[model samples]
Target: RPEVILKLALSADGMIGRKGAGQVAITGPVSRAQSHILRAQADIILIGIETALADDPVLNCRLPGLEQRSPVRVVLDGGLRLPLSSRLVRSADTQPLWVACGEEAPDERRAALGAAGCRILATETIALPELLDDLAAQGIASVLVEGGAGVAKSFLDEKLVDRLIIFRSPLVIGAADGVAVEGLETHIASEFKILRRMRYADDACAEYVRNT
Candidate 1:
């Protein structure tokens, strides 16, 4: 069986972005520590290409003892826009995997990335169920969806998310634009049951399991 987990950091006002284009790291210290712990437990660290391009994050397990056993890095590049020279592909620690949609990626780019050790898996579209099924077949017991709004929304829209973990900070940075758990507003009819709630410093961490 495959287990899907959504991990998000938000402000007290449920905002994930500030006035700028980048994401706001409002999650407190304790919650940040917990995030690392979760990373240590996951089989793969998944994120969208937009987030990877914007943040250039390694998305690896950074905990003291778990650093050696870093989870596989998976990127959703529907358009195959990830630069060939991106650190993710050039990194020596782990070879990143790209899930592309259609033939959006050029053959030259795909060949270059593949020669550099990046694995590209082409699909009809960014379908969550199909992706999860593929991952399950590859022995992916659990997946950590670290998002860029669109990816998270896709999972919610498909009702494929099995668990959600949100870390809310105390400060509220009012911004005209911000993204929450993507489909929260549109998928109002979909209900989830709270499995656990705890406070880490000034942040509140809520865990929800799918009701259906």
Candidate 2:
């Protein structure tokens, strides 16, 4: 069994983004501290193309003492939509692994990114089981799925997730629209057993173990 974890920061009302547009930062010093620690604990960090294109986040361990230990970054791009000049490609700390479907990424794009020192890992299809197998082969014992919703839903739908850590903020922006886990029309309910539930400054932190 592969160790897959879903880590997300949401609002008190479970809104990840504001209305369908801008993102709401998960504020509070303790929350940031906890998040940085969490980032350092994972072997690989995964995110979708939309999050990369929209945020271009440097998913690294930036805690005061843990800056030296950064996890490998993995991007899910079934359509190869990642921008060539995205920050993930230029960051000097760690190179990103582009997981793309074979039919999507063109030869030129792949070559360009490869020349730029980005590691390209392609598959015939973006199936969760195959991705896990590949990760396991690369010696990945645990994976942290940081998302734009669709990516998280993919793993959840496939019953690949083993844990979930959610940070809930206090503020609320009334946006009936926002993607938490895309491709989930019918919700995949889980009997996640609670592992940890605590408050980090102003945010509520809850960790759940996926009941097998």
Runs off by more than 4 Å, candidate 1: 92-96, 185-189
For candidate 2, lDDT tens digit of each residue in 1-212?
A: 45888877777766766554434577777777878887788888888877787787778888778876678888887666667677787772364455455667788777777777777786755777988888788888999888656676677777787888877788765556643545332332435777888865486788888665
Worst 10 residues of 2 by lDDT: 181-190
TM-score, structure 1 vs. true:
0.88
List the pairs of residues colliding in candidate 2.
149-180, 149-181, 149-182, 150-182
Q: Model 1 clash pairs? A: none
lDDT of 2: 0.72
Model 2 spans > 4 angstroms off? 19-23, 92-96, 180-189
Q: Which ten residues in a row have the lowest lDDT in candidate 1?
A: 92-101
TM-score between model 2 and native: 0.88
